[PDB]
Swiss-Prot record:
Gene3D superfamilies named in the record: Laminin
TIL domain boundaries: 5-60
Transmembrane helix in keyword set: no
Pfam families xrefs: TIL
Organism: Ascaris suum
Cellular component aspect of the GO annotation: extracellular region
Disulphide bridges: C5-C38, C15-C33, C18-C29, C22-C60, C40-C54
Main localization, broad class: secreted
Keyword entries, A-Z: Disulfide bond, Protease inhibitor, Secreted, Serine protease inhibitor
Family: Belongs to the serine protease inhibitor-like (TIL domain-containing) family.
Location(s) in or outside the cell: Secreted
Protein name (database record): Trypsin inhibitor
InterPro entries, per database record: Ser_inhib-like_sf, TIL_dom
Length: 62
């Protein structure tokens, strides 16, 4: 159904765009939703590392 991606975290999303962080599960964004494509998923629990890297919330720094 939803052709998963190769690397973890980066998964299929019908609405990409912005995401969450290790400090804001949901970041404000006047945008709407990027086209369907492999990307991060906040509604799941993935955050973006300062290095612009989508990783689980547990994979957060210390």
């Amino acid at each position: 159904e939803a052709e998963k991606c190769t690397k973890p975290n980066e998964q299929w999303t019908k609405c990409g765009g912005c995401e969450g962080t290790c400090a804001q599960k949901i970041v404000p964004c006047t945008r709407e939703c990027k086209p369907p494509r492999c990307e991060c998923i906040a509604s799941a629990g993935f955050v973006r590392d300062a290095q612009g890297n989508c990783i689980k919330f547990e994979d957060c720094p210390k």
